């Protein structure tokens, strides 16, 4: 997250850290949203790879066990059928991860609220992106969970020539693009929390940014539109 601030410890209890086993220890690679004691929602490209994945709930500082964290492995990976590992701009960048054991829910570990199927946010809706990705475009990964105000940029605008043009599909969400704040390498799969009538809900899954950099004017961070996959999500959980 570029242009953000260290989030208040566990203020986004559904935010999780997707880590893969590297050597003897673990390494953070993506973010995710806990949606069931045993299910995590993240980006497809975070899990194409044949890696040993672990998920951390109740996390904040990736380099210290503050005692609120829970470490569980990923038992099964379910990438959306239409996902094309070679064309992120094609969309369908979402995947569900059934956990080895179910996490114990508490004040640090909560499920994320998903929008109603098909919900479309009005332009410039208040949202916050959260993650452990880079904090300075072309810099270092964050030790502590970061957050940044990232209001939405409706399709009309986002798909305009000056913005993302044809790169963005209706099944996506754009936020930010003001040049100062945006997601960055390491935030993928993470959530985009949007406030709608007092209620927060994960409307997007962090997908991509421009080759030119993270915080690039008129190239807002792009997320998979959660409200566009509710049916798929429920089906995957029900039949697994």
């Amino acid at each position: 997250v570029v242009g953000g601030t260290e989030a208040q410890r566990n203020s986004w209890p559904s935010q999780i850290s997707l880590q893969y086993r590297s050597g003897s220890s673990w390494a953070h690679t993506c973010g995710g949203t806990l949606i069931r004691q045993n299910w995590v929602m993240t980006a497809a490209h975070c899990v194409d790879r044949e890696l040993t994945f672990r998920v951390v709930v109740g996390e904040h500082n990736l380099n210290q066990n503050n005692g609120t964290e829970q470490y569980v492995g990923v038992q099964k990976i379910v990438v959306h059928p239409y996902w094309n590992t070679d064309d992120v701009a094609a969309g369908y960048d979402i995947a569900l991860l059934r956990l080895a054991q179910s996490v114990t829910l508490n004040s640090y570990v909560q499920l994320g609220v998903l929008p109603r199927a098909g919900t479309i946010l009005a332009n410039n809706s208040p949202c916050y992106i959260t993650g452990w990705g880079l904090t300075r475009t072309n810099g270092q990964l964050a030790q502590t969970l970061q957050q940044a105000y990232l209001p939405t940029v409706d399709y009309a605008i986002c798909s305009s020539s000056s913005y993302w043009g044809s790169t963005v599909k209706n099944s996506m969400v754009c936020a930010g693009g003001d040049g100062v704040r945006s997601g960055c390498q390491g935030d993928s799969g993470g959530p985009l929390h949007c406030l709608v009538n007092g209620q927060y809900a994960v409307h997007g899954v962090t997908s991509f940014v421009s080759r030119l950099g993270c915080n690039v004017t008129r190239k807002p961070t792009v997320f998979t539109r959660v409200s566009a996959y509710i049916s798929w999500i429920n089906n995957v959980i029900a039949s697994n």
């Binding site: 980006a43 490209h45 899990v47 992120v88």
Partner: peptide, 7 residues
Amino acid sequence: ATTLXXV
């Protein structure tokens, strides 16, 4: 586009 994960 480039994914925020380093893909």
